[PDB]
Structure formats: structure tokens, C-alpha cells
Design a protein around this ligand. Structure first.
Ligand SMILES: CCCCCCCCCCCCCCCCCC(=O)OC[C@H](COP(=O)([O-])OCC(O)COP(=O)([O-])OC[C@@H](COC(=O)CCCCCCCCCCCCCCCCC)OC(=O)CCCCCCCCCCCCCCCCC)OC(=O)CCCCCCCCCCCCCCCCC
Ligand code: HEA
Ligand code: HEA
Ligand SMILES: CCCCCCCCCCCCCCCC(=O)OC[C@H](COP(=O)([O-])OCC[N+](C)(C)C)OC(=O)CCCCCCCCCCCCCCC
Ligand SMILES: CCCCCCCCCCCCCCCC(=O)OC[C@H](COP(=O)([O-])OCC[N+](C)(C)C)OC(=O)CCCCCCCCCCCCCCC
Ligand SMILES: CCCCCCCCCCCCCCCC(=O)OC[C@H](COP(=O)(O)OCCN)OC(=O)CCCCCCCCCCCCCCC
Ligand SMILES: CCCCCCCCCCCCCCCC(=O)OC[C@H](COP(=O)(O)OCCN)OC(=O)CCCCCCCCCCCCCCC
Ligand SMILES: CCCCCCCCCCCCCCCC(=O)OC[C@H](COP(=O)(O)OCCN)OC(=O)CCCCCCCCCCCCCCC
Ligand SMILES: [Cu+2]
Lengths: 54, 45, 59, 53, 133, 534, 102, 121, 47
């Protein structure tokens, strides 16, 4: 029992990570920030509070 | 006992066709632009 | 401390996502992105809809 | 005492590697402590007055 | 039982077409051949030696080359069709687009080379620049 | 599909996503370059009635997508994360969330470029972003900012990929593999990781200061304040020169692998070639300003730079001699990856020697920023990226997915795309040697026939790509029917002409790569016990 | 490159000595034909004896074809003629006079 | 439920069941039973003489014939092990695919390999 | 992640189902690919 679990978890320092949404949410946040800054510095709306919230 | 070759005989009889074929290949690969130049109205012909 | 071992045992017993640490924060943050980013990216292409169509054809 | 049918992943025997690794760990710790103390001493001796000047 | 002089339809079938027969009597015939080979050769007849050479040498399956029994003809036909299709599509799209250029016509080139002669430009070269009707 | 694909954390399931993104980007870019070539077939506004800014933006999109958005995810990311952890024998790469965030940070770059081209402003300053042309003085609108964010996200993804490759190679390599027996492709990708690591920060910082100049009403490199854009152009060339090695070195590794396996003989002094790639990577930093001879710097500096270039040229020639010795004195099977490798070793070598001739300090007076340089780099980009990707696909596709491809279709596809590439890129050197300018929607009426032949070759190439995507469709839909019949080759290794075929049943696929000895693709967390080499 | 033939030759006969089945015979034959070293008639006779021990005449056909065409050797023939006739009439393995006229 | 000493490596059930008690103030705890993660399985072992992920190569010198084929310990169904000749590096880098039922050979090396798994129910 | 055979799960495709015989998806791949060049040409000028 000990040998099989040691071999199956020894060279595997990576957890069985759940469907973590970190990459998609961080990519979505960066894209929103980029497009917001591009639209605000020179565009149609000069809004500043909501880009600060982003 | 040096049977047959005499390297020169087979050497020439084998490379001469190959070098001729390669020269023809290069001639075609350089004459296709020449063929285009001839076919096009380069001299109003 | 006095809560680390018990919390680890509970987590091992209940193999569930969200890591149990910040459920309220996750429930607060999940709808905010959908409410904010979608509604701020829709104008980006909605406003130039009338602006679009400049052919500038010349002859 | 978890069961083990044939072997509990025994691997290599308890050779001289155990005391070698212990000696490596203690040598690393002693080196870190000695270098920290020596740097503190040379700092409070000459480096700190020079920095203050 | 170490049959001797296996002169049957199996040997000619093996030499004629091996892949055709349905991969089931293969084990039987090769086992018989090896059983004969266990005893000394004693001048094997032509069909048996031909059969064992065909089995062991190849010209089938793994020994079948990347070039098939004449698919190079298909390759040539396909490449010719590809060139024809590409040139036809380019011709039709260029016809659809049309031309709206006020030069490349003969008069422009003749005036250009007349001015080139007047200014004496590129004397050791080609004064004619037409390239089109 | 969202539960496992959109939320993946597996290199196995993300390599195919990399491949799909790469092929989609490549086909879109080929269609868009088709548009670019078609509007340039004849002088005038044949298809683009005015608005040369549109042509400029089209060119910028083409170059950017070809450089950072098509080939980088394919051989760096897509091939690396499906070959390196597999060849190592480790179950999974270290912290695959790096790979996931590197993958997911791409698409908004595509959407920002498409929306920047959609707006009237556009980014029409070339793929180079030399100031002040990209600033508010000439090009306004968010297009510049969107392109800057796209290159920033691509750089971050490349850095993360290099992080994962470096950590996987150095920290959890298998016991059997050591320093003196490590294969070629992984050495190539590790050296590329070094070069990427040492090249990304300079572009990041310099482009950050350009953005700050555009925003903070300041100018560090623009003349409005006393700055000089020459400094930024040194920095940009310092980044750019290692980039071509970054995109060409994994190609070198895969080409070495395929020629070594297809010659039925081992490598020719693997130590010599790995030293050659290491020397190339280390010497890539000595020519940081070799691309900018046009200013008129001191003669000693130009002599030093041309000496550095001629020194850099030597390892490439030695490595070419290494492939030539590898293919010499060995059995040859004319399979399609070998055809790609041969086309590489011919045309890439010719392009590289032409560039070596161009590497002269005083020779930029006639060729720089002309069609000669585009004829130069199109050669190497096609050889080391397009053909290298085709070879890798046709060389691992039957096993990485279990689906075979039509050999006849592959042969006709290679022939079509090879002849198309030749007939497209050859006349460009004749345009360049005359002294024609670059990046102009309209040109004088001297070289119209060459533009026409380039256009017909482009149509041949796009028809070849259509045939290629049809081949992908057929492989994905009729792999089972193709495996049973004689439509394709099921053993890339014909048995030696001394051995019987019946013994060959146990000797199916034997080479110097472990993933070939694997069965049909198993679960992601395979490799329960790491491989050991005696 | 200044490599003695005797060492590898003796290695070849020693390997053929313990020829339990055809696998080691085939691998050693492939190794021998891998070098530019043209096999001696002695090692060829040893290989044929081992093939007789393992009882596979097609292996003898393959090795005879390999000796007929392995390297150009300036197109030497009489050497091939003697090196084939000695081993054909030493014991008798009639195989060449059949595949050619077929 | 509570802290586990885990002094021996044959008395731990569950990798996460052991965290490692520490000290808040005073002196540093000794690096024996105060590590979080499976790191103790290797550090305590190498403290007592047990190594992890052995790099020892197999018997390259032995040719592994049918009488005494070499033995590789792997409880998995398949294995990726091969031969490099009698010395460390002699011929091309190569490996085999041993399986539970039949065997495999090293081709040009001729080193017959065998898969030897531990008994399983 | 260990519940997949290792045959067709590596691609986001599905043979089963009459919604798409791998033709609607393939045509859609052409559509999404050819979007950017033609829309880029069309937004400021003619095709
Ligand atoms: C235009 C339509 C072209 C269809 C070609 C069909 C030819 C054929 O049978 O299969 C060729 C080939 C399959 O052949 P295979 O299964 O390998 O059979 C060969 C045997 O092994 C060995 O058999 P073989 O070598 O004896 O066969 C080759 C022989 C003569 O070989 C050829 O002529 C070579 C043709 C290959 C290129 C196809 C160009 C046509 O037969 C033909 O191919 C018939 C020639 C006339 C066909 C003209 C159509 O591929 C196709 O099935 C089509 C290839 C792609 C062409 C376009 C497909 C239609 C597109 C419709 C419009 C869609 C627009 C996009 C919408 C979004
Ligand atoms: C990946 C690199 C790559 C590729 C494939 C191409 C493909 C082509 N390129 Fe381009 N090009 C560049 C990289 C590339 N280019 C760069 C970096 C610039 C710089 C911009 C500048 O200089 O200012 C440039 C600029 C450039 C110009 C400058 C235009 C101007 O002066 O403004 C021209 C026109 O002369 C041109 C022509 C072509 C043509 C006809 C093809 C044709 O070959 C298109 C047909 C396609 C192929 C034959 C290859 C197939 C492509 C694939 C993606 C296959 C898909 C499958 C896989 C990837 C597995 N390219
Ligand atoms: C795939 C990408 C790639 C690769 C591999 C290369 C490889 C090389 N490149 Fe190029 N290059 C580009 C992509 C690439 N390049 C791009 C995108 C530009 C910019 C164009 C633009 O600005 O628009 C450029 C520009 C560029 C310039 C300036 C032109 C300019 O842009 O204005 C020069 C000249 O100095 C040059 C030289 C070389 C040399 C010498 C090699 C060599 O490393 C080639 C290696 C191969 C060989 C050298 C073959 C081996 C030779 C031998 C067999 C030995 C013979 C010689 C000796 C005796 C040693 N390149
Ligand atoms: C400026 C552009 C010109 C462009 C000119 C284009 C010409 C037309 C295309 C020619 C391309 C040559 C390769 C054709 C593909 C092919 O299959 O080649 C191999 C064939 C072998 O023969 P096969 O086609 O398989 O038919 C065999 C028939 N059996 C054996 C039953 C009797 O063997 C052959 O086809 C013959 C040998 C090839 C020799 C190549 C060298 C060139 C000389 C060829 C001379 C004869 C053909 C041309 C006659 C006009
Ligand atoms: C069914 C529909 C058929 C439609 C046929 C249309 C034919 C046609 O339009 O004429 C033939 C074309 C003309 O080419 P174009 O570009 O449309 O017209 C010339 C424009 N100038 C020269 C002023 C720049 O000429 C060409 O396209 C020539 C193509 C190149 C030659 C191919 C040769 C292939 C073998 C080598
Ligand atoms: C198909 C094979 C791949 C393309 C090879 C040719 C590309 C070069 C080219 O297509 O050249 C095109 C040039 C034309 O040049 P042009 O300026 O007169 O075209 C302006 C007028 N349209 O000659 C040709 O039309 C040659 C045509 C074939 C001649 C041989 C057969 C004669 C019957
Ligand atoms: C218009 C025609 C255009 C050409 C059409 C070709 C159709 C396919 C012909 C064919 O496949 O030819 C088939 C023939 C033999 O077929 P076979 O006689 O053995 O078939 C007999 C049994 N049925 O092999 C060849 O030619 C091989 C030619 C070389 C192929 C590999 C090329 C590698 C890259 C070369 C370029 C790299 C640079 C090298 C330096 C320049
Ligand atoms: C294919 C290559 C054709 C080259 C070519 O057709 O070239 C055009 C030349 C003459 O046009 P040009 O060169 O004098 O034009 C010079 C200035 N632009 O010949 C022809 O029109 C021959 C016409 C052949 C028509 C083929 C039938 C097509 C279907 C017609 C259905 C209606
Ligand atoms: Cu450079």
C-alpha cells in the first residue's frame, strides 16, 4: 500500500487541480483594463472611476 | 587483384549521366524565368 | 495553531472546490465581472456602428 | 501500521548516506550562522562608521 | 505429422497472391513450412523455396514502400489539376476585378523612351518598357 | 466542454488548443496576405481604391500575426509542452497553470487587432513601432495602444512558457537522462528559453517608455524634448535579432530529429551540434546594432559588427555539414517529412548564404529596407516555420492523436506549396537588387510581370493551404478507414534488408524518442513510474 | 580507421557459436554489414553454419544477396565468385539458381 | 484529527494527515516532524538512510540472455527501460517496451529484457 | 481526467450527433478564419 502510493505521488508534485477559472478571469481582467485604458485616454468616453475599479 | 576498376571507367559512366541531368535541371530552373521573358512582350514580339 | 490540523482534516474529509476560505468573496466577485466588463465592452463596438461604413471611394 | 504485501518501498538500505546528509545540513547551517556573525562583526567594526561618515 | 512434398494449391496461391487469402491459413502454412525446415533441406522443390523466400523477404506490408503500385500517376494528375485550378481561379478573379490603369499602353511607353533618348538615360541597356498592351 | 477544455490544467489537453489556434491564425493570415498580394498585382487601385493607410494596417497585421501570433504558439508552445514533458518521462509539467494563463492571454490580442483595424485610426506604422510615427503626432486612436497591449500579452505568454520549459528541464528531469546524453530538441528549446529570457525585458521596458511618452505628455526618444529614436531602435533591434533564432532553433532541433531517425543511423557528434546551438545563442547578442548600418556609425564599429556576423555564420555552416554527414552513408526512404527537411536544407541554406553576403557593413546601401531583405527573410521564415511545422505535424500526428494522413495528398501538398513558395519568393530578390522601396501600396511600372508571377504563386500557395485543410478534415474523419487500407504508410520504419518481416512484428517502431514507443495516447497523468536508462 | 579485423572477426565467430535462435544471428549479421568492412569468407561460412543450425534458408538467401550487392568495391566480381562458390559447395545450400529466373 | 509524530515512515496513512507541529516562540523546531507536504517522506528517509528516485542504472554489463534475463522492478503494466551496451555509453541511446506477458529485446544490443512487477490482487 | 479513452477526446469535436457532421463546424472554421481579412477590407473600402 505504502509503496504504490509513494510511487504514484512521489514524482507528481502537482495536485489534481480543479477546473480553476484563474487563467480565464485574469485574461478577461487584462483585456478589460487594456480596452478601457485605450478608450479613456483617447476615445469617446472620458470615464475614470470605473476603469479605476477595473 | 584490382578486378575491373580502374576507377575511371565506372566513375565516368556513372557521374556523367548524373552531372548532365543536374546541369539540365539547373538549365531548366534558370530558363523558366527566361521562358517567361521570351513569352512576355519584352520586345513587342 | 489550534485550528490548522482540524481544518486540514475537514478539508481532506470534504474534498470540495472553492477551498472553503473565501466563499462570500467569490460569490461577491463572480457577478461583478459579468456586470461590469460586458457592459463596458458592448459600447466599444455599439457606438461606432453608425460611424462604421466610411467607404471613401474615389475615381 | 499500514499494510504492505511485499515491500514498503524500502529502496536503498540505511547506508552512510544518512550521516552524510546530516553532516551536510549541519555544515550548511553552521556556514550560514558563521557568515552572518562575521558580516555583522565587520559591519559594526568598520562598515557602519564608514557608512555614518 | 511432417508431411513430405507439400505440392498443393497452397504453394502456388502463396507465390501468386499472399495478401489476398484471408490471413487465417497463414499460420498453418508457415507452421508446416517451419516443420519441413526442421528436417534437413534435402533439396527443397521450387514452390517451397519460392514461398519461404516470399514470406521472409517482403514486397508486402512492412516492406511495401511509401510509393505504391502506381499512385505516382495520381500524384502527377493531382498536381496538374492543382496548377490548372489555381491559374483558372486567378484568371477569373482578375477578370472580375478588371483594370483601371491609365498607363502601360503603347503611347505612354513610346513617349517615355523618346524622352529617355532625349535625356540619354540607360544607354547600355533596354529603352523599351512596355510589359503590357 | 467548458468543464474540462475551457478550464483545463493539462499540457496534453492544451497542446491541441495551441495547435488549433496556430492553424486558425495561419489560415487567416494566409488569406489576408492573399488580399495584400492581390491588391499589389498591378499598379494602381485594382482592388484597394485609395486609403493606403488600410494597406499599411493590413501589412502590420500580417507581419505581427506571422511573427508573434502564428509560429510562437506552434513550435515554441504547442510542440514544447507536448514533446518535452513526454520525452522526459515526468507525469506532468511543473505548475500547468503557467501554461493555461499563457494560452488564455492570447485571444484578446486578436480581438484588439481586429477592432483596431475596424476603426478609422488603424496602426499603419509597419510591424516596427519606430517613433514618432506611432505617437499622437501622426497616428492617433486606440489602435497603437491595442497593438502595444497585444505584444505585451504575447511577451508575457512567451516568458511563462520559457519559465515552464526551464523548470521542467532543470528541476524534475528523469534519472536516466543526464547532461551528456540529453537529446537535441530539448537542448534547442532550452537554449531558446535562455534567449527569450534575456531578450523579452528590453522590449518590454522600451515599449513601456514609448507608451508612457504617448500618455504622460512626455518624450524620452521623440525629438519633442531632446530625445533620439535611434536609442529605441537599438533596443528594438537588440530584441528582434534573437527573435529569429528563437523561431529557428526549435526548427533546427526537430529537423535534426527527423533526419537522424529517417537516416536509420545515430546523430553525427551530438556534442558538436549542441555546442553549435549554444554558440549561436551566446553570439546572438554581439550584433545588437548590426541591423542599423544606415546611420553612419564609426568604421571600427561597423567592422566589429561585420566580424561578429561572419563569426556567427560559421556555426550554421558547421551544423549544415552535420546534417549533410548525417544523411550521407545511410538508407533513405522518400517520405514526406524527409522532403520537407531536404527543401529546408536547400532553400534555407541559400537564403542564409544570401544574408551572409548581405551582412557586409557597406552593402546595406543597395539592399536595406528594399525587396531584397524581404526576399531574404521570407526564405528563412518559410523554411524554418512553415515547412518545419508541416514536417513536425506529418511526423508525430499518426501517434500523438492516432490518426493517419493520406500519403498521396501529403506528397501533392508538399509539391504544390514548395513550387508556390519558390515562385513567390524568388522574384523578390530581383526586385530588391534593382533598388525598389518597401511598404508602398503603389509602385512604378517597371516590374509588373514579377508582381503578376508573385500573385499567381500566391494563388497556388493558397490552393495548397486549402488542400492541406482538406487533408486535415480527411484525417480527422477517415483515419480508421485509412489505417486498414493501403492509402497511407503505417510504419515509417521499413525493416532492414537482412531481417524477416515476421520478426518485425515485435520491432514495429524503434527510435531514439520515447513517445514513439508509447501506445495510443493514454490519460493525461500517465507515466506512473519514471523511465530509467541503464 | 586503423582498426584491426581480427578482434571483431573473432567476436563474430564467438557470437555465432552460441546461436540459440535467429535473433542474435540477425543482429550480428546486420552489425557486420553495418561497417565498411567486407566480411571474410570465414565469417560468411560461420554465418551459414549458424543459419543451418537455426534452419532458415531464406536468411541464407538474404545474406547471399547482400554479399552480391553490399558495396561497390570497384565492382569486383571474381572475389565474389570464389566467396560464393566455396560456401555453396562446402556443404550445399542451393538457393541462388531459383529466384533469379523467376 | 490531531498532530502525528510520524517518526517512522511505515506508520503514516494519508499524505495530508500530517502537517508537522511547530513552535511559536523560543527555539527553532528541529527539521524532523515540522514540514508541510510530502517532503518529510524523503527528508526523514535520507536522515535515516532512505533515498528517493534512485538514479542507479540497471546491470549494463550483463547481457541478459534467456537463462538469466535482467530484472526491473515496476508494478505498472508497462515499462520504458533499455540497454546502452556493457559500458555507460557504447551504442545509440535506446530503450525497450517491456510488458507483463511477453518480453522484448534490445535489437542491435541483443539484451533481452523482462518486466518484473510486484504481486497484485 | 482519467475518464477519457484516448481516441477522440483530444479534439473539441464529436462524431456522434446529427447537429454537425463535421461539416457545419468546418464551414464555421472557414467563416471565422475569413472574417478578419474581408471585414477589414469592407469596413473602410470595398472587397
Ligand atoms: C472540383 C471538384 C473536385 C473533386 C475531386 C474529386 C476527385 C476524387 O475522386 O477524389 C480525389 C481525392 C480522393 O481520392 P482518394 O480517395 O485518394 O482516391 C484515389 C485512389 O486511392 C486511387 O485512385 P486513382 O488514382 O485511380 O484515381 C485518380 C483518378 C485521376 O486522378 C486525378 O485526376 C487526380 C485528382 C486529384 C485532385 C483533385 C482535382 C480535381 O481519378 C480521379 O481522381 C478522377 C479525375 C476527375 C475528377 C474531377 C473532379 O480527394 C477528394 O476526394 C477531393 C479533393 C479535394 C477537391 C475539392 C473537393 C470538392 C470541393 C467542392 C467545392 C467546395 C467549396 C468549398 C465550400 C465551403
Ligand atoms: C510566418 C512568417 C511569414 C509567412 C508565412 C509569410 C507569408 C507571405 N508573405 Fe510575408 N512577412 C513576414 C512574415 C511571413 N510572411 C514578416 C515578418 C513581414 C514584415 C513586414 C515588413 O517587412 O514590414 C512580412 C511582410 C511581407 C511583405 C511586405 C509588404 C510590404 O512591403 O508592405 C510582402 C509583400 O511583398 C509579403 C508576402 C508574403 C507572401 C506572398 C506570403 C505567402 O507565402 C502566403 C502563402 C503562405 C504560405 C505559402 C505559408 C503557409 C502559411 C501557413 C501558416 C501554413 C499554415 C499551417 C501551418 C502553420 C502548420 N510579406
Ligand atoms: C527565420 C528567421 C531568420 C533567420 C534564420 C535569419 C538568418 C540570417 N540572417 Fe536575417 N533577417 C530576418 C530573419 C532571419 N534571418 C528578418 C525578419 C529581417 C528583417 C527584414 C526587415 O527589416 O524587414 C532580417 C534581416 C537581416 C539583415 C539586414 C537586412 C535588413 O533587414 O535590412 C542581415 C544582414 O546583416 C541578415 C543576415 C542573416 C544571416 C547572416 C543569417 C544566418 O544566420 C543564416 C544562417 C545560415 C547560414 C549562414 C548557412 C550556413 C552557411 C554556410 C554553409 C557556411 C558558409 C559561410 C561561411 C564560410 C561561414 N538578416
Ligand atoms: C519548361 C517546363 C517543361 C515541363 C515538362 C513536363 C513534362 C511532363 C511531366 C514529367 C514529369 C516526370 C515525372 C513523372 C511522374 C512519374 O510517374 O515518373 C516516373 C515514371 C515511371 O513510369 P510510370 O509513370 O510509373 O509508368 C510505368 C509504366 N510501366 C512501368 C508499366 C511500363 O517515369 C517517367 O515518367 C519517366 C522518367 C522521368 C525522367 C525525368 C527527366 C526528364 C526527361 C523526361 C523525358 C520524357 C518525358 C518528357 C517528354 C516530352
Ligand atoms: C471559365 C472562365 C474563364 C475566364 C478566362 C479569362 C481569361 C482572361 O481574363 O484573359 C487571360 C488572362 C488575362 O490576364 P489579366 O490580368 O486578367 O489581364 C491582363 C491585365 N494586364 C496585362 C493589363 C496587367 O491571362 C492570364 O490569366 C494568364 C495566366 C498566366 C499563364 C498561365 C500558364 C500556365 C502554364 C505555364
Ligand atoms: C502553371 C505552372 C506554374 C506557373 C509557371 C508560369 C508562371 C509565370 C507566368 O505565368 O508567366 C506568364 C507570362 C505572361 O506575362 P505577361 O506580362 O505577357 O502577362 C500579361 C498578359 N496576360 O507568360 C505566359 O503567359 C506563358 C503562357 C504559357 C506559354 C507556353 C504555352 C504556350 C501555348
Ligand atoms: C508539371 C510537373 C511538375 C512536377 C510534378 C511531379 C509529380 C510527382 C513526380 C513523382 O512523384 O515522381 C516519382 C518518381 C519515381 O516514381 P516511380 O517511377 O519509382 O514509380 C514506379 C512505381 N510505380 O520519384 C521522383 O521523381 C523523386 C524525385 C524527388 C522527390 C523528392 C524531392 C525532395 C525535394 C527536392 C527539392 C529540394 C531541393 C533539391 C535541389 C533542387
Ligand atoms: C490559361 C492561360 C490563358 C492565357 C491567356 O488567355 O492570355 C490571353 C491571350 C491574349 O490576351 P493578351 O495577352 O493579348 O492581353 C494582353 C494585354 N492584357 O490569349 C487568349 O486570350 C486566349 C484565350 C483562351 C481562352 C480559353 C477559354 C477560357 C474559357 C472561355 C469561356 C467563355
Ligand atoms: Cu540581425
Amino acid at each position: 500500500m505504502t509503496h504504490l502510493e509513494r510511487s504514484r505521488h512521489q514524482q507528481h508534485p502537482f495536485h489534481m487541480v480543479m477546473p480553476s477559472p484563474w487563467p480565464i478571469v485574469v485574461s478577461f481582467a487584462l483585456l478589460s483594463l487594456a480596452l478601457s485604458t485605450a478608450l479613456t485616454m483617447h476615445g469617446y468616453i472620458g470615464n475614470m472611476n470605473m476603469v479605476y475599479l477595473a | 587483384g584490382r578486378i575491373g576498376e580502374s576507377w575511371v571507367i565506372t566513375e565516368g559512366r556513372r557521374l556523367i549521366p548524373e552531372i548532365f541531368q543536374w546541369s539540365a535541371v539547373l538549365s531548366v530552373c534558370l530558363g523558366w524565368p527566361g521562358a517567361v521573358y521570351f513569352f512576355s512582350k519584352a520586345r513587342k514580339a | 495553531a489550534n485550528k490548522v490540523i482540524q481544518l486540514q482534516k475537514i478539508f481532506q474529509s470534504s474534498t470540495k472546490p472553492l477551498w472553503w476560505r473565501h466563499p462570500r468573496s467569490a460569490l461577491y466577485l463572480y457577478p461583478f465581472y459579468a456586470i461590469f466588463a460586458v457592459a463596458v465592452v458592448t459600447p466599444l463596438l455599439y457606438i461606432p456602428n453608425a460611424i462604421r461604413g466610411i467607404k471613401a471611394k474615389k475615381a | 501500521l499500514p499494510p504492505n504485501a511485499l515491500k514498503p518501498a524500502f529502496g536503498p538500505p540505511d547506508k552512510v548516506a544518512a550521516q552524510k546528509f546530516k553532516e551536510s545540513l549541519m555544515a550548511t547551517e553552521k556556514h550560514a550562522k558563521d557568515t552572518s556573525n562575521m558580516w555583522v562583526k565587520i559591519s559594526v567594526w568598520v562598515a557602519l562608521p564608514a557608512i555614518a561618515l | 505429422a511432417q508431411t513430405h512434398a507439400l505440392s498443393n494449391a497452397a504453394v502456388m496461391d502463396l507465390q501468386s497472391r499472399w495478401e489476398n487469402m484471408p490471413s487465417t491459413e497463414q499460420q498453418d502454412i508457415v507452421s508446416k513450412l517451419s516443420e519441413r525446415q526442421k528436417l534437413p533441406w534435402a533439396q527443397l522443390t521450387e514452390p517451397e523455396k519460392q514461398a519461404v523466400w516470399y514470406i521472409s523477404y517482403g514486397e508486402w506490408g512492412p516492406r511495401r514502400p511509401v510509393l505504391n503500385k502506381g499512385d505516382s500517376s495520381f500524384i502527377a494528375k493531382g498536381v496538374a489539376a492543382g496548377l490548372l485550378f489555381s491559374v483558372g481561379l486567378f484568371a477569373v478573379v482578375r477578370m472580375a476585378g478588371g483594370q483601371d490603369a491609365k498607363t502601360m499602353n503603347k503611347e505612354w511607353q513610346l513617349k517615355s523612351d523618346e524622352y529617355l533618348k532625349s535625356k540619354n538615360a540607360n544607354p547600355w541597356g533596354g529603352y523599351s518598357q512596355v510589359q503590357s498592351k | 466542454m467548458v468543464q474540462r477544455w475551457l478550464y483545463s490544467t493539462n499540457a496534453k489537453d492544451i497542446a491541441v488548443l495551441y495547435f488549433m489556434l496556430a492553424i486558425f491564425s495561419g489560415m487567416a493570415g494566409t488569406a489576408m496576405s492573399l488580399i495584400i498580394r492581390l491588391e499589389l498585382a498591378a499598379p494602381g487601385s485594382q482592388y484597394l481604391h485609395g486609403n493606403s493607410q488600410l494597406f499599411n494596417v493590413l501589412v502590420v497585421g500580417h507581419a505581427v500575426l506571422m511573427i508573434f501570433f502564428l509560429v510562437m504558439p506552434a513550435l515554441i508552445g504547442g510542440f514544447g509542452n507536448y514533446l518535452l514533458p513526454l520525452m522526459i518521462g515526468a507525469t506532468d509539467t511543473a505548475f500547468p497553470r503557467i501554461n493555461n494563463i499563457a494560452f488564455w492571454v492570447l485571444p484578446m490580442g486578436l480581438v484588439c487587432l481586429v477592432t483596431s483595424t475596424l476603426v478609422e485610426s488603424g496602426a499603419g506604422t509597419g510591424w516596427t513601432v519606430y517613433p514618432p510615427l506611432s505617437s499622437i503626432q501622426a497616428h492617433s486612436g486606440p489602435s497603437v495602444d491595442l497593438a502595444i497591449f497585444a505584444l505585451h500579452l504575447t511577451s508575457i505568454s512567451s516568458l511563462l512558457g520559457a519559465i515552464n520549459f526551464i523548470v521542467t528541464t532543470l528541476n524534475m528531469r528523469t534519472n536516466g537522462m543526464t547532461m551528456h546524453k540529453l537529446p537535441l530538441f530539448v537542448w534547442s528549446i532550452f537554449i531558446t528559453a535562455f534567449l527569450l529570457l534575456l531578450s523579452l525585458p528590453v522590449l518590454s521596458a522600451g515599449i513601456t517608455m514609448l507608451l508612457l511618452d504617448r500618455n504622460f505628455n512626455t518624450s524620452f526618444f521623440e525629438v519633442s524634448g531632446g530625445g533620439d529614436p535611434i536609442l529605441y531602435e537599438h533596443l528594438f533591434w537588440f530584441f528582434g535579432h534573437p527573435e529569429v533564432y528563437i523561431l529557428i532553433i526549435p526548427g533546427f532541433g526537430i529537423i535534426s530529429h527527423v533526419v537522424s531517425t529517417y537516416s536509420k543511423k545515430p546523430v553525427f557528434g551530438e556534442i558538436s551540434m549542441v555546442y553549435a546551438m549554444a554558440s549561436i545563442g551566446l553570439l546572438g547578442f554581439l550584433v545588437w546594432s548590426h541591423h542599423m548600418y544606415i546611420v553612419g556609425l564609426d568604421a571600427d564599429t561597423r567592422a566589429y559588427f561585420t566580424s561578429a556576423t561572419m563569426i556567427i555564420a560559421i556555426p550554421t555552416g558547421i551544423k549544415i555539414f552535420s546534417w549533410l554527414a548525417t544523411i550521407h552513408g545511410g538508407s533513405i526512404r522518400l517520405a514526406t517529412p524527409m522532403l520537407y527537411a531536404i527543401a529546408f536544407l536547400f532553400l534555407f541554406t541559400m537564403g542564409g548564404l544570401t544574408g551572409v553576403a548581405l551582412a557586409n557593413a557597406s552593402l546595406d546601401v543597395a539592399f536595406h529596407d528594399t525587396y531584397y531583405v524581404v526576399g531574404h527573410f521570407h526564405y528563412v521564415l518559410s523554411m524554418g516555420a512553415i515547412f518545419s511545422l508541416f514536417a513536425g505535424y506529418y511526423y508525430w500526428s499518426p501517434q500523438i492523436l492516432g490518426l493517419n494522413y493520406n500519403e498521396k495528398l501529403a506528397q501533392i501538398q508538399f509539391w504544390l506549396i514548395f513550387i508556390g513558395a519558390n515562385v513567390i519568393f524568388f522574384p523578390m530578390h530581383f526586385l530588391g537588387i534593382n533598388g525598389m522601396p518597401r511598404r508602398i501600396p503603389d509602385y512604378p511600372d517597371a516590374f509588373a510581370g514579377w508582381n503578376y508571377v508573385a500573385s499567381i504563386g500566391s494563388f497556388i500557395a493558397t490552393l495548397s493551404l486549402f488542400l492541406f485543410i482538406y487533408i486535415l478534415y480527411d484525417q480527422l474523419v477517415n483515419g480508421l478507414n485509412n489505417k486498414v487500407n493501403n492509402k497511407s504508410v503505417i510504419y515509417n520504419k521499413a525493416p532492414d534488408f537482412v531481417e524477416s518481416n515476421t520478426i518485425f512484428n515485435l520491432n514495429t517502431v524503434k527510435s531514439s524518442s520515447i513517445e514513439f514507443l508509447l501506445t495510443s495516447p493514454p490519460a493525461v497523468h500517465s507515466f506512473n513510474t519514471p523511465a530509467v536508462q541503464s | 580507421d586503423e582498426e584491426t579485423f581480427e578482434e571483431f572477426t573473432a567476436r563474430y565467430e564467438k557470437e555465432f557459436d552460441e546461436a540459440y535462435d535467429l535473433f542474435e544471428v540477425q543482429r550480428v549479421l546486420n552489425n557486420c554489414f553495418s561497417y565498411d568492412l567486407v566480411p571474410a569468407p570465414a565469417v560468411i561460412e560461420k554465418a551459414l553454419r549458424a543459419a543451418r543450425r537455426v534452419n532458415d534458408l531464406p536468411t541464407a538467401i538474404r545474406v547471399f544477396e547482400a554479399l552480391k550487392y553490399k558495396v561497390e568495391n570497384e565492382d569486383q566480381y571474381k572475389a565474389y565468385l570464389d566467396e560464393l562458390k566455396d560456401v555453396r559447395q562446402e556443404l550445399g545450400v542451393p538457393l541462388k539458381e531459383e529466384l533469379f529466373p523467376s | 484529527p490531531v498532530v502525528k509524530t510520524a517518526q517512522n515512515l511505515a506508520e503514516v496513512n494519508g499524505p495530508e494527515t500530517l502537517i508537522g507541529p511547530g513552535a511559536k516562540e523560543g527555539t527553532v523546531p528541529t527539521d524532523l516532524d515540522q514540514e508541510t507536504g510530502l517532503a518529510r517522506l524523503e527528508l526523514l528517509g535520507k536522515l535515516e538512510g532512505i533515498d528517493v528516485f534512485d538514479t542507479k542504472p540497471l546491470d549494463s554489463s550483463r547481457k541478459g540472455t534467456m537463462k538469466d534475463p535482467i530484472i526491473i522492478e515496476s508494478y505498472d503494466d508497462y515499462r520504458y527501460v533499455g540497454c546502452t551496451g556493457s559500458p555507460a555509453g557504447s551504442h545509440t541511446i535506446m530503450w525497450l517496451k517491456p510488458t507483463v506477458n511477453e518480453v522484448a529485446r534490445c535489437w542491435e544490443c541483443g539484451s533481452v529484457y523482462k518486466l518484473n512487477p510486484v504481486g497484485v490482487p | 481526467v482519467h475518464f477519457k479513452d484516448g481516441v477522440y477526446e483530444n479534439i473539441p469535436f464529436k462524431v456522434k450527433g446529427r447537429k454537425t457532421p463535421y461539416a457545419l463546424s468546418h464551414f464555421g472554421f472557414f467563416a471565422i478564419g475569413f472574417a478578419v481579412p474581408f471585414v477589414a477590407c469592407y469596413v473602410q473600402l470595398k472587397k
